[PDB]
């Protein structure tokens, strides 16, 4: 548990807090509480992948090949997208605690706030477009109600045909509206501006502020498309970002390979608790300490907790092999006191090689993170100009 | 038991009864003495769900599609109320509960008592009319004999259909009417002054009065109007409520999950039995109380009961988890005594954030009852405003 | 047309039935509240 | 009864009467007598007993 004094703070708390709600909000809809619709996975991650769903709710070989490469490649974007998100968060989180060493924000937490207050908007904008579809069914119930009483041309959804509805056929509606019913649908404008609210109190930096009306823009066009033609502009963008998807997933192959390679740039809760099968090691048939096994133990957890006293001035946590190893020699008599052991591990750490892939993985993911980044917002930058030129061009 | 006198009783008491009677008269309903009708489920809790209930009573695709659909949505409205109806009455007799703290009715007996005032009108208007149709279907009977006898169009409920009873067709029923029976049917208005006098007899508030005069106004219309006209109009009440109905169940969602974080906001009596066991973890290889189960069980049992003395001036009443936790320490050597346990509890109840929890709870129970009481005065408000517009529209 | 009949001999049945036990359930109800308040006032 | 009147006491009220914390506090029948008397005077059952 954590026992620190919160006193003032004024910010990463907050916005805690609402990420907490989020995520919850998040969990209790994919709970799926009651009956609702959602027949097949319906995810809803991102939009392409909501359009994607929406697809799968919906000569003979022609389209049996072109659904499947439609299922092939959107799943395969789908999947390279939530990996790569998965990756970054892990980095992120290990490039935080690395910077921890030492409410001390610097530039580490500083790109930490900037992509929580990104994940704040996007779960806030899923959750109020989720909200937002219960009613928009609720009063589609209705409008199909009152359609099916006058008349007009109708479909599975129940909703007269935009296409095939004339002045007349909508006069129906209008008169309608005109007796009862008072559904302003006025939303579109108020929605955005309390989600700002919203964001006010939480507290969003102007790029923030800018992306969630991005969003808004994006969104409120794709939900004003027809569904045939919402499909066409959602696989038009997943084209116009599938190389900036290639990018980004092997960015995301190779800093997994350097993880791989590096224990620095990504440590372990889970070896803390394994250290003391190598203190067995140091009693079968050996001459360890004189009877410290609880000491050892206490200052092999203390390492691995604070880590050692660096001779340049510093102090870093040992991986978990590299120990091992250390302590792994052709003999273990050599390594007997407690002093003579810490030597051994500070020589080894010092290594030429070793040193180098110290401050090698610092970089490494700190680049990774940025990489990432540009790579999101290139995509959203895309996203918007397609979005806005094609919306321009219909209207 | 409880051996307190009563002596004037004059409020929330003469309430108590009648809303036992109520509550037993809808037992008994619900029982079905003897062989009635109700072949579904006729549950009968509110207009909207009565209304289903009648309809469960009651190309190929479409009717296959719309049907699902309307039960889908009807069962989901009325399983939100519900749920949200019973959240809010356990978080009501919680906070009356916490506020019977030290007949002592302030302003969150007075909240109980409008809340009692608006349940006891509604149960007493739901008798009232389930009273009615037994006389209703048996004077029925009369009025198809005698159309049947005379001859006028039919359907399967046998009374001569209203659409095509020309006044022609009508006058047989009013020569049958001057020959005998003498059916003024007047009730529809002595019927509700009857119920006032009924509510005078108990004492309501002018609130109360309101809400069930326009509960006989929209109660009389709905039964006035035709079965599918009644179907289409109880749809449009329930799609005018949907978004009210959302905006309670996501609040209601919200507050329970809160409770489920705060113990202070919701107490429970079945502790009071379990901390006989924390008792045994007393005993087993532990120093505690010399030889003072019993008593360690009686101060136990107190401080559950009436609350331990905080410092402030205060007197409030420890939870579970906190007490166990409290008491389950690295080494159960630290606590023996009576004194140094209770020191304990109370340094353990000042905890800052323990605290703001504390005096959280009451702030958001009282913000959830009076979020669920906005919801209902707004979907009353809203169905007797579209009810009587409506009445007005048809003549 | 014969849902009619089905219909109407079913409901009258169960209304009369209603009736007719209500009636005698509220008399065995009665005679035992007399009994009662006879055996209350033979006090004495 | 104290006032002047004699009420035949009910079945549950009496079992309830006897069946005390410790019965060793009821032993004569003057003790018990009294306890009857002094719980069939009380306000509410008084009321209750006129109210039937």
């Known amino acids: 548990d954590r026992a620190a004094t919160r006193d003032a703070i004024t910010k990463q708390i907050s916005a805690q807090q609402n990420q907490a709600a989020a995520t919850q909000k998040f969990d209790d809809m994919q709970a799926e509480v009651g009956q609702r619709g ?41 999947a390279g997208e939530q990996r790569a998100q998965a990756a970054a968060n892990r980095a992120a989180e290990a490039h935080s605690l690395s910077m921890a060493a030492g409410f001390t924000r610097e ?13 704040l ?18 009063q589609s119930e209705i409008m199909r109600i009152v359609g099916k009483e006058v008349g007009m041309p109708t479909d599975d959804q129940g ?28 939303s579109p404008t108020e929605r955005r501006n309390a989600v700002l609210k919203s964001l006010v109190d939480a507290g969003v930096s102007s790029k923030g502020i800018a992306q969630a009306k991005q969003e808004m823009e994006l969104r409120e066009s794709l939900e004003g498309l027809a569904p045939q033609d919402r499909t066409k502009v959602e696989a038009t963008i997943g084209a116009v970002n599938a190389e900036l998807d290639t990018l980004q997933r092997t960015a995301t192959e190779d800093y997994e390979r350097e993880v791989a390679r590096n224990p620095f740039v990504e440590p372990d809760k889970d070896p803390l608790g394994s250290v003391n099968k190598i203190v067995d090691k140091a009693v079968k048939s050996g001459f360890g300490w004189e009877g410290d096994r ?24 040992v991986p978990s092999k590299l120990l091992e190893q250390a302590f792994n020699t052709t003999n273990t008599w050599l390594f007997k006191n407690a002093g003579d052991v810490e030597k051994r591990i500070i020589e080894l750490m010092t290594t030429d090689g070793m040193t180098q892939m110290r401050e090698d993985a ?30 321009r061009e219909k209207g």
Request: glycine content about 4%.
């Open 294 to 317: 609880q000491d050892l133990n206490n200052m092999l957890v203390d390492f691995a907790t604070n880590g050692i006293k660096l001779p340049d001035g510093r102090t870093a946590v």
């Open 38 to 78: 959602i027949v097949d996975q319906l995810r809803t991650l991102s939009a392409e992948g909501r359009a994607g769903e929406v697809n799968q709710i919906l000569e003979i070989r022609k389209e049996l090949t072109g659904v499947q490469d439609a299922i092939q490649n959107r799943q395969y974007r789908a």
């Open 362 to 391: 610092p970089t490494i993911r700190e680049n990774f993170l940025k990489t990432v980044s540009d790579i999101a917002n290139q995509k959203r930058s895309n996203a918007v100009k397609v979005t806005r030129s094609a919306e």
């Open 107 to 119: 530039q580490r937490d500083e790109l930490r706030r900037d992509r929580d207050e990104a994940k």
């Open 159 to 186: 909703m007269p045909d935009m296409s095939r509805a004339s002045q007349d056929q909508l006069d129906a509606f209008s008169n309608a509206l005109n007796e009862a019913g008072v559904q302003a649908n006025t």
């Open 121 to 138: 908007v996007s779960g806030t904008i899923a959750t109020t477009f989720q909200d937002y579809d219960e009613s928009r069914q609720a």
